Design a protein around this ligand. Structure first.
Ligand SMILES: *[C@@H]1O[C@H](CO)[C@@H](O[C@@H]2O[C@H](CO)[C@@H](O)[C@H](O)[C@H]2NC(C)=O)[C@H](O)[C@H]1NC(C)=O
Ligand SMILES: *[C@@H]1O[C@H](CO)[C@@H](O[C@@H]2O[C@H](CO)[C@@H](O)[C@H](O)[C@H]2NC(C)=O)[C@H](O)[C@H]1NC(C)=O
Ligand SMILES: *[C@@H]1O[C@H](CO)[C@@H](O[C@@H]2O[C@H](CO)[C@@H](O)[C@H](O)[C@H]2NC(C)=O)[C@H](O)[C@H]1NC(C)=O
Ligand SMILES: *[C@@H]1O[C@H](CO)[C@@H](O[C@@H]2O[C@H](CO)[C@@H](O)[C@H](O)[C@H]2NC(C)=O)[C@H](O)[C@H]1NC(C)=O
Ligand SMILES: *[C@@H]1O[C@H](CO)[C@@H](O[C@@H]2O[C@H](CO)[C@@H](O)[C@H](O)[C@H]2NC(C)=O)[C@H](O)[C@H]1NC(C)=O
Ligand SMILES: *[C@@H]1O[C@H](CO)[C@@H](O[C@@H]2O[C@H](CO)[C@@H](O)[C@H](O)[C@H]2NC(C)=O)[C@H](O)[C@H]1NC(C)=O
Ligand SMILES: *[C@@H]1O[C@H](CO)[C@@H](O[C@H]2O[C@H](CO)[C@@H](O)[C@H](O)[C@H]2NC(C)=O)[C@H](O)[C@H]1NC(C)=O
Ligand SMILES: *[C@@H]1O[C@H](CO)[C@@H](O[C@H]2O[C@H](CO)[C@@H](O)[C@H](O)[C@H]2NC(C)=O)[C@H](O)[C@H]1NC(C)=O
Ligand SMILES: *[C@H]1O[C@H](CO)[C@@H](O[C@H]2O[C@H](CO)[C@@H](O)[C@H](O)[C@H]2NC(C)=O)[C@H](O)[C@H]1NC(C)=O
Ligand SMILES: *[C@H]1O[C@H](CO)[C@@H](O[C@H]2O[C@H](CO)[C@@H](O)[C@H](O)[C@H]2NC(C)=O)[C@H](O)[C@H]1NC(C)=O
Ligand SMILES: *[C@@H]1O[C@H](CO)[C@@H](O)[C@H](O)[C@H]1NC(C)=O
Ligand SMILES: *[C@@H]1O[C@H](CO)[C@@H](O)[C@H](O)[C@H]1NC(C)=O
Ligand SMILES: *[C@@H]1O[C@H](CO)[C@@H](O)[C@H](O)[C@H]1NC(C)=O
Ligand SMILES: *[C@@H]1O[C@H](CO)[C@@H](O)[C@H](O)[C@H]1NC(C)=O
Ligand SMILES: [Zn+2]
Ligand SMILES: [Zn+2]
Ligand SMILES: [Zn+2]
Ligand SMILES: [Zn+2]
Lengths: 695, 695
């Protein structure tokens, strides 16, 4: 009927209702119950109105602890073992006293083993630096259990960087210093992190992507698995998660040496000593890890709803988010799955009245995402050939909240204008903004730098299910949540990240009581999907990619100019890239201009025009992918070989330049940079020629 | 105006005329004259009617001999050198007495050097077997100049396989046994091969593809070259071409041992002895190679004509062939470039009358093709992003003749019906077929096996410029020449292959005097291009790919069943592949059925339908390419890792199974096969799902 009709049908009492139906039971990927909910969402979506809706399943390498011989850490001495055994679970949150299946905190895909040894504290594991700083104090971690605190680099590396040091095992704990909001209680009546609360998470290093055994190809029934030994990124030494009341007891007896800088202190009731083993009455004392987990090929299910387009049924607009959780999924991911759920119900409500989108809309409820985005990925490995030629845009939908302090958006420069324009025509739920545009609300609370006349839109890359569609296939995409003030709280995710206490009540009673915020994100998300899958000419605006590219070039250029001498020494130019960028900007100009003058009456032209737009995003994908990582192919946006969080764009160049100073062979060193500058340039140029007049 | 109008405008007196204008001067790729002709064809095409026409150029690693210190081989003894020095050129053919620039026979990209050593004859170099048969007679070729005869495996390997034996250098000669048509004279009044005639050719091993220095990326002005040392497939020991009058003198004094089988005899006025060095009065005698050639980064030019479509200007149909020759290019490639030339002139003639093709037609005159398909490739490396999403079909056009005995076609099963249907409505030039369809002529003279009710259509793969478009990008394509009787002459190419005597007169006076054949191929070629770039629904017919796939599976399946025991031992099934094939066939069925029922009135559907067709060919491309060769990505058709000429389809599986008997680790051995069967299957299946109902 019309955009409005759609939005207006999105009620909060439903998303609230839904969140509740999804939170009561543990839905660990592969579990006998995650499957029941799969079936549920399947059935429920057919009822709302979807045309097609089925389960996509793959046999994926998953991993769980042995219910019989539980995992834990402890301290040993003169043949004495019992000396303090770790928690065997997390104190079940309130109402969830007697609830079967809650799985004991555990690092996924950890190798079996019961290693004995001294400990060596490490600021958030090897942020590279931190372990590249054990030479400043003679420390051969080899044969020593390194304990590190979550934060900074994605935990995987923490474990891997830990292997490159010699580690015998890894103790990863959630330190208050990082995520423990100043001035709040511990979950029950908290909102913050309880001492017994542990943060689950997987330690796979699938740099690129896939099930650790089916790289490039689907984990279908007739597939050929690799074999643990030759798998993809499995850790080589045991790993286990600790709560801080529990981390303290370990860091307590910790008897090391001079803790480098003042940053290595995690604000705990103890002194942060790095040095090996314990001291004093504790000298024969040593920590022992007990991990008895097994990796199993498990069947996983993806729910895939389908709403046939009316005009361009061969063009796909995807709205997807994972359903598989770690325990209940208060926020991650149920807080998002419900929004999706309402969004479908609404489109469904609309299909029943006799309406269809211009383009086709696909809804997915990914599985195994907490185990390495397995679900979404393998389904895409499978349908590349179609997404590749039909993928229009992909909108991801995991957690919907993190705060009350405004809207958060991440997306391909193509969808900026869309986000902008849409958000302007949307009611702001924020407190103190009666009848104010969501845009107004959003802008004021987090002004986009450089041109604060508008909202801050960040980049995608690395993380949720969108990873595949964006950094591997090249499908324009974005995400949108509700977050905290970027200055009051400086830390990463929300406290209680992958913890037990991530429960329904936690949201309803501390985050979004009225569910305003959830409803908003829902309108935001909905709109995107809607516009994308229904607006005559695609909601993309190439000009923006121009604008950003320049900035990108400048930023990367100045990184290189941090060696003005070495640059002229080895003849390292940048005109090429900057050139390419230039034309892109000039080429995009004319295309945009040319986009308004054509008579939208003639389809083929419209289409031809549209495909230029659709495929532009794909134009930035280099088939050969990045260096030693083939599943990251987005020349522009893509995880940096090195620091994935503190990274930039033009990863190729960045990694090339990263720490070039101490590069042993000064010549090849710049050859590489001098090289990526080339590719980056080539790509930008080619990406541009796309928008250049066909024929 | 109409298909006919086009064909009827193709006159023989022009193609004849053209061939003459292109043959009078040496156009070695990169030469100051190959560039003049580039400019010529550029100008000439604009005049015929093309809308756009420009030069695409890249700086490519080429290679030529030193005009001052000429290359040659010879025999040495007790400090005596002069003992028989090789020919320093080929006796200039007739009228071409005083013609500057004729380049002395030479193996391209050969390393410098003047090695001394005994010789060791080898049946057509290591067909693998031949060198894998020097153990049956204690022979460490190490530090020994191996001389081998062109034939069987593509010369590159001959040289490489020669390196794996220890070779110090390589003497490659054109032996009569193989190509010397029984019952003909030596060129001048010949048609056959003169004794002094030498066959040029490059020895690069670009398995995948590209300029040996710009792999994956264009050899544009700002590119970053690799560096000889770390180049792609350069030989590591000198190589030089010999004529047989000259090969004899070397094989003459040849004093070896027991020449294995009876096949190692090249019908020369001498006994074919393998064994090291010479015998008798010749014992201190040893051959010395003198190669002083240099590899240089040379500018190359590609002429690219453009005829804007009228409806689908974003969809490309390409007609292309190389222009760069080795000396004059009697046949290869001028014999084809003229056909193209006439074809353009005709379409041009037609554009001027106020007509345009539905789809866009692109005409290319590739450069550097004799040096490693460099021209075509690098232009494609550059425009992948467009061909990838707009490439409809690519028709190659090198030599147009090889015989008088009927038509030859090679092409993606998709274009069979097109070739069939087109050829039926075409006049047959053959002698003894007055008013008979070219189809009739063609069928009768070479019946397609299995279903002889129709013409034999062979597969593409490895060779001419189409390599890129087909085995790397995945663009449906084909070729068409006029060849010899497949039974009267059993050898490979035509005598005088890459020789001097490949001259205009050679064609006009021995091959196609009236130019009937050239005109035909021209209509054949034209038609393809025409239909493809103008017929409403694409001239493709997926059903055929079904039919062929089965056959392929069967054939490969039976190769595996050559070990019924080992198969059950290691659980090696084939149901998956056969399954996939099944559905493909079933899926294609419905798509085809579904293709006739839709109302061709509604464009978008037509288009959606069309893209299914267009992209099907691309559906068979595995991004990860084949094992240790990333530029060969066509799961179905693609050079076999091992025997490139005597190879099959499903290369993955084939190579996996090839010589599995003597595979050291019997377990991993089948793991690999058990693996490719998987991928092949996956691909076939995925390739099929493409044709499955969108949305
Ligand atoms: C969970 O751990 C137990 C350890 O008791 C595993 O049992 C092993 O296998 C069988 C019993 O299934 C015993 O004969 C072995 O002695 C046990 N060895 C070990 C690992 O201690 C059990 O297999 C594990 N869970 C399962 C069934 O996979
Ligand atoms: C959600 O927003 C409310 C505001 O409506 C937050 O409440 C304040 O939280 C801060 C801590 O950041 C306290 O210092 C204040 O005392 C609280 N009330 C005031 C004065 O606003 C609430 O903490 C937020 N919780 C989240 C992020 O869900
Ligand atoms: C977002 O909205 C703005 C204005 O509402 C659009 O830009 C204007 O578009 C109209 C017609 O589309 C043109 O006549 C104006 O010249 C444009 N002005 C500006 C500010 O450029 C913009 O195209 C919209 N973007 C999308 C696709 O949502
Ligand atoms: C062609 O070969 C000659 C050999 O005489 C090369 O000359 C070398 O380089 C200079 C002259 O250009 C002399 O000083 C050297 O002594 C020569 N050395 C060699 C290879 O013998 C000449 O360079 C070659 N062609 C070119 C100019 O590239
Ligand atoms: C082209 O075709 C003619 C036939 O029109 C060939 O002439 C015959 O060639 C064979 C050798 O294959 C001789 O034995 C005959 O004596 C020739 N005449 C007859 C009886 O047909 C001619 O050789 C062919 N040359 C090519 C391949 O261009
Ligand atoms: C080649 O020609 C044949 C017949 O001339 C085509 O097949 C017939 O096509 C018509 C209409 O297209 C159908 O009504 C018949 O049922 C078809 N019969 C057969 C033999 O299948 C065929 O489609 C043509 N192929 C192309 C695309 O050139
Ligand atoms: C979530 O809601 C659905 C429907 O509102 C519930 O549906 C199931 O349970 C009902 C009993 O309360 C049965 O009568 C339905 O037949 C059954 N259908 C489905 C969807 O499988 C579902 O149980 C709710 N989840 C819970 C238990 O909270
Ligand atoms: C091939 O044919 C062309 C045109 O028919 C020739 O054209 C060039 O030479 C002419 C002299 O014969 C000049 O008058 C033309 O201006 C010039 N134009 C071009 C195409 O460059 C061309 O020389 C012929 N090639 C030869 C020498 O055989
Ligand atoms: C919560 O109470 C129940 C019932 O008293 C306890 O569950 C026990 O019985 C269940 C069958 O109804 C089994 O599924 C449980 O495995 C079993 N629990 C034990 C003793 O292992 C349950 O333990 C209580 N909650 C807890 C774990 O303290
Ligand atoms: C063919 O005759 C010519 C002229 O007599 C010879 O060419 C010589 O003069 C040319 C200038 O017109 C130069 O370009 C040639 O390099 C030069 N040739 C020599 C002697 O090296 C030509 O040699 C004769 N053909 C041959 C090579 O025998
Ligand atoms: C570990 O579990 C408890 C924890 O305090 C300890 O008392 C016990 O001795 C240890 N396990 C055993 C029984 O060896
Ligand atoms: C466009 O930018 C490219 C960068 O690759 C540059 O080389 C080229 O010269 C520019 N276009 C023009 C007008 O030449
Ligand atoms: C090689 O060239 C001729 C060929 O017979 C020979 O006579 C000569 O001695 C050799 N080169 C020289 C002059 O050393
Ligand atoms: C189609 O073929 C595939 C081969 O991958 C097979 O697994 C599948 O079962 C077939 N389709 C059906 C109807 O299941
Ligand atoms: Zn999540
Ligand atoms: Zn998560
Ligand atoms: Zn050729
Ligand atoms: Zn050739």
């Amino acid at each position: 009927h019309n955009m409005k009709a759609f939005l207006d049908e999105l009620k909060a009492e439903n998303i609230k209702k839904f969140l509740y139906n999804f939170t009561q039971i543990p839905h660990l990927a592969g579990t006998e119950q995650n499957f029941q909910l799969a079936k549920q969402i399947q059935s429920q979506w057919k009822e709302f109105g979807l045309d097609s809706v089925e389960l996509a399943h793959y046999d994926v390498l998953l991993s769980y602890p042995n219910k019989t011989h539980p995992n834990y850490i402890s301290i040993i001495n003169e043949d004495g073992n019992e000396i303090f055994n770790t928690s065997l679970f997390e104190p079940p949150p309130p109402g969830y006293e007697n609830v079967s299946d809650i799985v004991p905190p555990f690092s996924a895909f950890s190798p079996q083993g019961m290693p004995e040894g001294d400990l060596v504290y490490v600021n958030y594991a090897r942020t590279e630096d931190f372990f590249k700083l054990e030479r400043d104090m003679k420390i051969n971690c080899s044969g020593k259990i390194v304990i590190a605190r979550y934060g900074k680099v994605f935990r995987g590396n923490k474990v891997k960087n830990a292997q490159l040091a010699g580690a015998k095992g890894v103790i990863l704990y959630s330190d208050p210093a990082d995520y423990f909001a100043p001035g709040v209680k511990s979950y029950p009546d908290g909102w913050n992190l309880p001492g017994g609360g542990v943060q689950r998470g997987n330690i796979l290093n699938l740099n690129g992507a896939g099930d650790p055994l089916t790289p490039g190809y689907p984990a279908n029934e007739y597939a050929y698995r690799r074999g643990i030994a030759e798998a993809v990124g499995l850790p080589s030494i045991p790993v286990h998660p600790i709560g801080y009341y529990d981390a303290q007891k370990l860091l307590e007896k910790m008897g090391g040496s001079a803790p480098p800088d003042s940053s290595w202190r995690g604000s705990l009731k103890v002194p942060y000593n790095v040095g090996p083993g314990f001291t004093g009455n504790f000298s024969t004392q040593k920590v022992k890890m007990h991990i008895h987990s097994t990796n199993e090929v498990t069947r996983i299910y993806n729910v895939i709803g389908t709403l046939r387009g009316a005009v361009e049924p061969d063009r796909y607009v995807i709205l997807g988010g994972h359903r598989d959780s770690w325990v209940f999924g208060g926020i991650d991911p149920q807080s998002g799955a419900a929004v999706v759920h309402e969004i479908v119900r609404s489109f469904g409500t609309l299909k029943k009245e006799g309406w269809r989108p211009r383009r086709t809309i696909l809804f997915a409820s990914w599985d195994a995402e907490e185990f390495g985005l397995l679900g979404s990925t393998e389904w895409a490995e499978e349908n590349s050939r179609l997404l590749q030629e039909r993928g229009v845009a992909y909108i991801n939908a995991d957690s919907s909240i993190e705060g009350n302090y405004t809207l958060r958006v991440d997306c391909t420069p193509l969808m900026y204008s869309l986000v902008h324009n849409l958000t302007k025509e949307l009611k702001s739920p924020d407190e103190g903004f009666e009848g104010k545009s969501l845009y107004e609300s959003w802008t004021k609370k987090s002004p986009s730098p450089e041109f604060s006349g508008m909202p801050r839109i960040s980049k995608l890359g690395s993380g949720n299910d969108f990873e595949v569609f964006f950094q591997r296939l090249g499908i324009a995409s974005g995400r949108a949540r509700y977050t905290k003030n970027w200055e009051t709280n400086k830390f990463s995710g929300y406290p209680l990240y992958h913890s037990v206490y991530e429960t329904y009540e936690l949201v309803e009673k501390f985050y979004d009581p009225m569910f305003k915020y959830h409803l908003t994100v829902a309108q935001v998300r909905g709109g995107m999907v809607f516009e994308l899958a229904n607006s005559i000419v695609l909601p993309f605006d190439c000009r923006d990619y121009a604008v950003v590219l320049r900035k990108y070039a400048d930023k990367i250029y100045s990184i290189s100019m941090k060696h003005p001498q070495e640059m002229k020494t080895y003849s390292v130019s940048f005109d090429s890239l900057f050139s390419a960028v230039k034309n892109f900007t000039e080429i995009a100009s004319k295309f945009s201009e040319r986009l308004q003058d054509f008579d939208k009456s003639n389809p083929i032209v419209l289409r031809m025009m549209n495909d230029q737009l659709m495929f532009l995003e794909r134009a930035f994908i280099d088939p050969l992918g990045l260096p030693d990582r083939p599943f990251y192919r987005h020349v522009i946006y893509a995880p940096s070989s090195h620091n994935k969080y503190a990274g930039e764009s033009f990863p190729g160049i960045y990694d090339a330049l990263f720490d070039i100073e101490s590069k042993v062979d000064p010549s090849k060193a710049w050859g590489e940079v001098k090289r990526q500058i080339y590719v980056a340039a080539f790509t930008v140029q080619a990406a541009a020629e796309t928008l250049s007049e066909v024929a």
